[PDB]
């Protein structure tokens with residue numbers, strides 16, 4: 208059976224391969240080599256799990272194919288679903304309905320988790336009879352007890368607007384919303400022809416009628432969208448408002464979350480914001496981050512740029528990493544070193560093990576020698592390519608000849624630029 | 632000075648409003664003969680105010 212998330216580029220990264228003392232192992236769970244960069248990743252991951260401070264930023268820099276996104280995915284996988292890890296690209300902010308600043312604001316607020324716990328007394332039971340004359344009575348039922356309730360004006364109005372019939376397992380809370388939870392217990396045989404799209408006959412509840420329902424759910428600090436309109440939950444599934452007013456975003460929601468945390472009804476859990484390829488950001492977003500990192504409850508940023516001394520978009524000034532120095536000053540730069548003949552073959556072997564490709568030692572050697580001359584991801588793709596070419600060859604073990612067949616079939620950037628002599 | 636002298640005294644329907652209810656509270660703890668606890672609901676089949 209095939210799942211939605213089959214093996215991809217970084218599927219082999221099943222967490223960050225460190226020790227109890229953050230010491231990087233040579234061969235570990237997915238990650239390989241890059242000892243210093245991986246130890247720095249573990250340090251920032253511990254700083255994350257701590258969450259005592261805000262406004263931290265680490266920038267992983269290195270040549271393309273050194274494992275920046277690999278370390279990012281390792282940190283993401285090591286940071287369980289408990290805390291949010293919002294991984295956005297460097298171009299997911301250039302929106303048409305949102306400005307280049309509200310996008311970063313929403314991304315920040317999305318990386319701050321909040322575990323809400325709610326308690327409520329609930330009445331649940333099968334409705335036996337509803338008499339009405341206005342005032343009336345209601346006979347709820349459960350295998351443990353059967354009761355009587357006198358209904359008031361609002362109760363009767365809600366009951367009539369919900370059209371609850373006999374046998375329906377009604378559910379009533381204080382400050383009655385009157386959730387018609389389940390369908391009918393009895394009065395079956397409607398399946399003879401049809402059932403309502405909302406009918407879920409499942410049997411009548413057991414146990415006591417009244418109960419205390421404690422419900423815990425993890426939301427994000429972006430819940431301002433859940434207030435920014437009349438029907439708010441709807442705007443949470445699509446683009447939504449162009450931008451929620453600051454006069455509410457930055458004061459009202461924050462104060463209410465503080466009150467919740469003081470009363471003990473909720474608790475904030477900061478997360479991580481991984482902005483990949485941040486070199487595309489304009490100087491405006493960088494000047495915004497300059498102050499955003501100064502705020503009180505900002506998440507920790509993880510940037511991954513592969514550009515050296517290059518021009519900053521929107522301007523003509525060259526700078527390291529292609530971003531402003533006033534922003535680089537507030538970061539913490541880690542460096543990833545290029546892989547060697549020893550590490551390239553190791554990660555290639557791990558990638559072969561991923562899809563369970565049995566490769567010979569000569570094939571491993573030749574593929575490593577190829578990838579050390581052209582590119583790493585090129586040799587990674589050659590793994591699956593040769594695997595398929597040999598599976599069609601009625602083979603079981605990929606060999607040097609099948610690897611060279613693919614090497615000749617599929618070109619790389621270098622050989623393609625070389626063969627581009629015709630100039631159409 | 633400025634005063635108000637609303638009048639409806641030509642009929643008794645007005646004069647009947649003030650003494651409308653003037654009734655006190657007489658829902659009391661409906662102790663049940665099972666546990667002697669804050670009785671919760673009257674059983675529609677036994678008409679007894681049971682708690683547990």
Ligand SMILES: Nc1ncnc2c1ncn2[C@@H]1O[C@H](COP(=O)(O)OP(=O)(O)O)[C@@H](O)[C@H]1O
Pocket residue numbers: 216217219237238239240241269270271272273274275276277278554557558583584587
């Ligand atoms: N240290 C490592 N451990 C495991 N796999 C690695 C490692 N370094 C590179 N790889 C493999 O090489 C591939 C390319 O690395 P990638 O993360 O794309 O580099 P970059 O981060 O520079 O874009 C990844 O998909 C990964 O599977």
